[PDB]
């Protein structure tokens, strides 16, 4: 029939009511400033999104404009100001509100109150406004009460061909708003992907555990890239959500994936750690014959050859018990220090960020001693500790096959890279390969300054070696400072194998050895005195 809509704009309180149900109320004293936005379905009046943009603060207006362009035309838009929404409201945002039929939106001023109910693409249903009389005053509070007539059930839905991909789309698009082209009537965005297959895929029956919280926009972005990776089996993917939030799971449903909701046992990083334990146990129970599990976080972009990389390297894990894991992530692999998308390293850490867990390691070693919910310990910090890692290493690529967007790291886009010399990553073979690399490496002059380009001969394709001061296995004094000035990862030590770091500078491979601590101190000529840097 007709919706009776109330929208209240005020210095200290904002609310919206639909047919007597208050679907928004905010009186918080330090939160909720700015332009609140509620989007209704124009045939039922259910809310499909709630937002608030603090346009008193810089750049929040751009986020508002963006969200609004992602709302399908036809939906009821509801705007109400709390306290102040004009100071950083730029002209682009004012222009869009004008385009939606608002007259007082585009002229909004300091501490004005403003309430608006309009359908995207006209007409407007109602508007109220109060101008502040003084810089130290607010506009009078303002209550807009208006009827919005409901659309037919048919005029509110896109009419797509009844492919039942499009049923999944419609189930999503009639509930959730703000996702843009995935719900556009003409030219909808694919929610199904045809990634090139992966011949002889040794990762085919390995479950993918997607670790998710309450950031459905992140999940949406990650899932698309995962499902675009050559070699994905969608039915092997399980999205584990820590909590019963609907919108993350509607996103799971949109792609037709399996999702598990989990009651959080809190708090802080203890809550995250217990979610990981719950998810890894569930993964191995859902797949009782699985020998490994891929662990992915919702804030990663998955490289197109992610499963190609895993498939070529997985046999290292089953064949070499001194390996802890395979990770897609190279902590030191920035765009200027990574180059070869086919090169692999061994590192004495556990990088996470797209990694492979051996079942036996989890069921036999890690699960029985997993930190109890009382410990505020990071799960990954805990697995890197000595009694968990027990000396083992992880396989990483020089060019990462994941990208962390969770808010300049090198991210591989080349399809189907054949990895070079995989079997020389086994424990003994890698040592031979390290020796063979240093016997061929051109020692640099160490009277130069390592932090500046002139330290390496302007060339490409060469492999160079430097030696730095490392008195004990604990002693990363020079390395840490070197890392800073090479503008690489610097905060904790990553990238070391028995006192060797491997990198690239100016497209030359660049070995670093800490002497005398490293067993590779042997390959240093006596003429050379190791470099030393200090804060």
């Amino acid at each position: 029939r007709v919706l009776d809509v109330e929208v209240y704009s005020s210095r200290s309180k904002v609310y919206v009511a639909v047919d007597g149900t208050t679907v928004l109320e905010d009186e918080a004293r330090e939160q909720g400033r700015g332009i609140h936005v509620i989007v209704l379905n124009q045939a039922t009046g259910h809310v499909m999104a709630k937002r608030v943009f603090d346009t008193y603060s810089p750049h929040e207006d751009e986020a508002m404009v963006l969200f609004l362009n992602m709302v399908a035309p036809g939906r009821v838009l509801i705007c109400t100001v709390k306290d102040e929404g004009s100071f950083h409201l730029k002209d682009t945002a004012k222009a869009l509100l004008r385009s939606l039929g608002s007259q007082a939106g585009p002229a909004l001023g300091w501490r004005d109150t403003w309430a608006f109910v309009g359908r995207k693409g006209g007409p407007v249903f109602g508007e109220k406004h109060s101008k502040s009389p003084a810089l130290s005053s607010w506009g009078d509070p303002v209550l807009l009460k208006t009827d919005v007539p409901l659309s037919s059930a048919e005029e509110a839905e896109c009419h797509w061909a009844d492919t039942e991909l499009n049923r999944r789309r419609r189930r999503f698009c009639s509930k959730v708003e703000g996702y843009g082209s995935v719900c556009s009537c003409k030219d909808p965005t694919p929610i199904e992907f045809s990634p090139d297959p992966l011949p002889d895929n040794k990762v085919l029956n390995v479950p993918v555990a997607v670790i998710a919280g309450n950031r459905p926009n992140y999940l949406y972005r990650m899932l698309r890239s995962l499902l675009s990776a050559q070699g994905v089996s969608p039915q092997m993917i399980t999205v584990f959500i820590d909590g019963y939030y609907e919108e993350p799971m509607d996103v799971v449903a949109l792609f037709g994936l399996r999702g598990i909701q989990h009651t959080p046992i809190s708090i802080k990083n203890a809550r995250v750690s217990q979610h990981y334990k719950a998810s890894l146990t569930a993964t191995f129970n859902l797949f009782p014959e699985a020998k490994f599990a891929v662990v992915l976080e919702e804030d990663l972009d998955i490289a197109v050859d992610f499963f190609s990389f895993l498939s070529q390297s997985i046999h290292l894990l089953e064949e070499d018990d001194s390996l802890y894991c395979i990770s897609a992530w190279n902590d030191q692999g920035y765009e200027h220090t990574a180059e070869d998308p086919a090169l692999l390293y061994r590192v004495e850490t556990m990088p996470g960020l797209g990694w492979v867990l051996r079942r036996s390691l989890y069921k036999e070693e890690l699960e029985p001693k997993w930190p109890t919910p009382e410990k505020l310990w990071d799960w990954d910090m805990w697995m890197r500790m000595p009694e968990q890692r027990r000396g083992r290493e992880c396989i990483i690529p020089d060019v990462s096959r994941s990208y962390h967007f969770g808010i300049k790291h090198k991210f591989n886009t080349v399809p189907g890279v054949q990895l070079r010399n995989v079997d020389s990553l086994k424990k003994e073979a890698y040592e031979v390969e390290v020796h063979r690399l240093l016997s061929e490496a051109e020692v640099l002059d160490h009277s130069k300054n390592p932090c500046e380009d002139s330290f390496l001969p302007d060339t490409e394709g060469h492999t160079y070696v430097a030696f730095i001061r490392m008195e004990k296995d604990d002693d990363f004094t020079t390395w840490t400072q070197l890392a800073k000035c090479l503008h690489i990862w610097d905060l904790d030590v990553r990238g070391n194998h028995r006192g060797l770091w491997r990198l690239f500078r100016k497209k030359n491979h660049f070995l670093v050895v800490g002497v005398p601590a490293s067993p590779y101190s042997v390959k240093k000529p006596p003429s050379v005195t190791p470099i030393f840097l200090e804060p």
Side-chain angles (χ1 to χ4, degrees), residues 181-185 187-391:
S181 320
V182 69
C183 290
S184 180
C185 284
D187 67 85
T189 286
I191 59 160
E192 207 188 56
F193 302 85
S194 46
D196 292 332
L198 170 69
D200 207 13
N201 169 24
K202 318 206 154 288
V203 153
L204 182 68
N205 304 123
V206 176
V208 180
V210 171
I211 304 307
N214 188 28
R215 306 177 283 171
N217 51 327
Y218 285 19
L219 184 58
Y220 175 84
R221 175 190 158 145
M222 184 259 283
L223 282 185
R224 298 183 19 104
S225 68
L226 169 62
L227 279 26
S228 306
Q230 170 189 24
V232 278
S233 327
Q235 61 206 10
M236 303 297 284
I237 299 166
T238 315
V239 177
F240 297 93
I241 304 173
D242 187 46
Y244 279 73
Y245 322 93
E246 286 202 6
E247 191 170 322
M249 182 147 257
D250 302 331
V251 166
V252 180
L254 165 72
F255 294 115
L257 307 177
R258 181 193 305 109
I260 299 299
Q261 294 186 303
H262 163 250
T263 311
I265 188 163
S266 282
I267 61 186
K268 221 76 174 69
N269 56 347
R271 173 181 170 179
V272 174
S273 175
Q274 304 307 306
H275 186 219
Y276 266 83
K277 177 190 183 185
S279 294
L280 298 168
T281 300
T283 296
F284 287 125
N285 282 334
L286 289 159
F287 297 89
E289 312 296 340
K291 299 302 194 185
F292 307 91
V294 176
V295 189
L296 304 183
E297 323 172 6
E298 74 187 326
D299 52 359
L300 306 166
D301 292 315
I302 305 295
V304 62
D305 74 322
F306 179 96
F307 292 100
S308 149
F309 155 71
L310 269 39
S311 180
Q312 305 181 51
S313 46
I314 189 56
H315 75 277
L316 300 173
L317 278 193
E318 33 190 32
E319 293 175 8
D320 178 1
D321 295 337
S322 80
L323 294 179
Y324 200 40
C325 52
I326 300 165
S327 168
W329 182 262
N330 183 359
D331 298 281
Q332 318 288 20
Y334 291 79
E335 293 242 49
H336 56 291
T337 46
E339 185 74 30
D340 191 346
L343 180 61
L344 298 180
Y345 304 137
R346 285 181 72 112
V347 289
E348 296 170 349
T349 188
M350 151 50 204
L353 271 25
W355 55 291
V356 181
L357 173 69
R358 197 170 330 178
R359 183 199 196 95
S360 76
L361 176 68
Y362 181 75
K363 302 298 300 184
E364 296 182 353
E365 297 193 40
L366 295 188
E367 193 179 28
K369 55 178 173 172
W370 201 274
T372 77
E374 298 293 317
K375 308 261 135 209
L376 299 343
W377 304 343
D378 305 282
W379 67 268
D380 52 337
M381 163 257 179
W382 174 76
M383 305 166 64
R384 296 195 264 262
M385 289 180 72
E387 321 90 283
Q388 285 47 71
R389 206 177 76 233
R390 319 203 76 256

Side-chain angles (χ1 to χ4, degrees), residues 93 116 124 136 140 228 305 365 411 532:
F116 181 81
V124 316
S136 73
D140 287 330
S228 306
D305 74 322
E365 297 193 40
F411 182 49
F532 181 113

Side-chain angles (χ1 to χ4, degrees), residues 31 60 79 135 252:
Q31 332 275 317
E60 291 265 344
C79 298
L135 290 185
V252 180

